[PDB]
């Protein structure tokens, strides 16, 4: 006869939603993160096939919540620019101006407060044409009727720092090591890790910037590739090099506005004012789109024409490629990259810079990016795309893909797609021949 025997410590787990904690080696990766052991461990699980679903993984929601909370906290011990919503007297900037940035930078004078309440000062600052709406040459900041504005602290860097998400004791992180993994379904090669890899909290739309490349071939990941309402995450096999610049020699002035509070403002552009263009390698980009089309044909057919076109419309954050380069917020016009028909040098993108940014598509909390002095270089790797598919087609042998995004969680799904968090249940029973 067989008897119940109780075992404690069996390698059993079930899917669960728990809170993970930050570890790291600044807005992100602050001193509240614990230090990371320099020796990671990865305990490969032989003979184990686990079901993954990157589209319902709660650590993407946890990542999003942590990023929102860190962003909100970093703006708390900083100067709130409530007195800056005043009537601006603005004229156009014509000193050495080029023919491309025509009517983009505006010289604006205004009556600013000073250290003493009794007195006011007449001061001037340069503003972009996206951060000025026209009341009634009288202008105001775009946020003054929708949001309170906080200035970012000048000593806090906006550079992303890799953050490792680690599970608490009693829980485990399972990493899918397969190379053809499409985001859903069984994974025959699973390993257990203490923490995730170093994930940079890069904020971008349209195109994905720095990150982890696909190991074998370009991967097309969607919850439902035939459903229009879902975003398509394209993970590159090889990076596409992008060099964005802010060629203007800028300078920063400090305007005292109150008892210890200061506003950092643009003073003048030393030299010619030129467009902050960005260059993406042309041959690499075309080769990459050829790979993307070759992979899409496995989902839509090998007799379907694949078309690329630019964004159909929406806010500046989603119709242009937004990113943080050197502390400035760039919105680059990627309608020179999604223009092609696929039948079965470098590319220069104009960009705009915005100083009044309403991050995470919220209403009521605006931030003022203080200007950075000097020219600005960024060299980075395009590692993926967020595409959508145009619906309602009447020509059945062709598909049109346009860039999309704007929901930042779909950026982090490109990094957390390999990881699932499970709860360990070490207690179990089994029949044996032993009797107490």
């Amino acid at each position: 006869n067989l008897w119940v025997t109780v075992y404690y410590g069996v390698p059993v787990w079930k899917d669960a939603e728990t809170t993970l904690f930050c570890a790291s080696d600044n807005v992100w990766a602050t001193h509240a993160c614990v230090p990371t052991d320099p020796n990671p461990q990865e305990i490969h699980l032989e003979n184990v096939t686990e079901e993954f679903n990157m589209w319902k993984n709660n650590m993407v929601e946890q990542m999003h919540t942590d990023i929102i909370s860190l962003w909100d906290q970093s703006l708390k011990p900083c100067v709130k620019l409530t007195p800056l919503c005043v009537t601006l007297q603005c004229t156009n900037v014509t000193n050495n101006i080029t023919d491309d940035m025509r009517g983009e930078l505006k010289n604006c004078s205004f009556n600013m407060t000073t250290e003493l309440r009794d007195k006011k000062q007449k001061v001037y600052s340069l503003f972009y044409r996206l951060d000025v709406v026209q009341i009634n040459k009288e202008y105001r900041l775009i946020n003054c009727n929708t949001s309170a504005i906080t200035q970012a602290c000048p000593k806090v860097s906006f550079e992303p720092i890799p953050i490792h998400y680690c599970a608490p004791a009693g829980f485990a992180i399972l990493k899918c090591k397969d190379k053809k993994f499409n985001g859903t379904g069984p994974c025959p090669s699973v390993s257990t890790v203490q923490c995730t890899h170093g994930i940079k909290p890069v904020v971008s739309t349209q195109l994905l910037l720095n990150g982890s490349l696909a190991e074998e071939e370009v991967m097309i990941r969607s919850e439902n590739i035939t459903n229009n309402a879902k975003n398509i995450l394209v993970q590159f096999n090889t990076p596409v090099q992008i060099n964005c610049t802010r060629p203007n020699n800028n300078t920063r002035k400090s305007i005292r506005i109150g008892p210890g509070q200061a506003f950092y403002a643009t003073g003048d552009i030393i030299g010619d004012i030129r467009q902050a263009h960005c260059n993406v390698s042309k041959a690499t980009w075309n080769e990459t789109l050829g790979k993307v089309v070759k992979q899409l044909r496995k989902h839509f057919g090998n007799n379907t024409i694949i078309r690329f076109a630019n964004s159909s419309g929406g806010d500046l954050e989603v119709t242009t490629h937004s990113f943080n380069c050197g502390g400035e917020f760039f919105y680059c016009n990627t309608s020179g990259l999604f223009n092609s028909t696929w039948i079965s040098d470098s590319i220069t993108l104009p960009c705009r810079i915005k100083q009044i940014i309403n991050m995470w598509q919220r209403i009521g909390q605006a931030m003022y990016a203080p200007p950075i002095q000097g020219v600005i270089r960024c060299v980075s790797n395009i590692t993926g795309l967020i595409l959508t598919r145009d619906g309602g087609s009447t020509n059945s042998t062709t598909e049109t893909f346009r860039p999309g995004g704007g929901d930042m969680r779909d950026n982090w799904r490109s990094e957390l797609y390999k990881y699932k968090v499970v709860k360990i249940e070490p207690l179990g029973v089994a029949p044996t021949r032993c009797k107490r």
Partner: antibody
Amino acid sequence: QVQLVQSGAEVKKPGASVKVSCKASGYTFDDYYMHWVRQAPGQGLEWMGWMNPKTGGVNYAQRFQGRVTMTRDRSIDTAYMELNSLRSDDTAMYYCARDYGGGYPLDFWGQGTLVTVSS
Amino acid sequence: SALTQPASVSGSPGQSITISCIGTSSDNVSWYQHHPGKAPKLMIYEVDNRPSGVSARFSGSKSGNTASLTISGLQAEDEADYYCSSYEVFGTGTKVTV
């Protein structure tokens, strides 16, 4: 109770533009996609497009691309549909339908507006 | 795709006629009821699932390459145009005349 209230019926001439409003109530506007659909003048339902109000993103049916502009005003939770260069084929009942979470369930379907095109 | 539906279904109360959506792909088949003079409504969420608050009389099913809507009995109140849908594609409408 979730409700979607649309503007009244309008009659326009060929070549004119029409902006149809849809005010949402009873739910958080930003979290659910809006879908605009035609009834067509005595034919079945024809889908024209959707808009994601959280980002403002739009997805237009291929046959209407270049003619329809979708937008919103998030401060009073109202979506707008603008049709340019109207033609006599465009007379129809027009509806705004919320989305069921994500995907293509059109759930709450509003009240509709009759756009008439004639000379 | 190009969904094909039966243009006209006829009967009387208790006949329990069934409407067929020919040409649909698998999963996420939805059904809509359209009353002239009123905006339509969603009868079937996905294949068979129904919204809370709608009578149990309507029940969906799938037959591999065909979907269907079963009405347990054509009550007099329930006359309208029923449209099946997979993604944006709509059928031609079934005139459910009593």
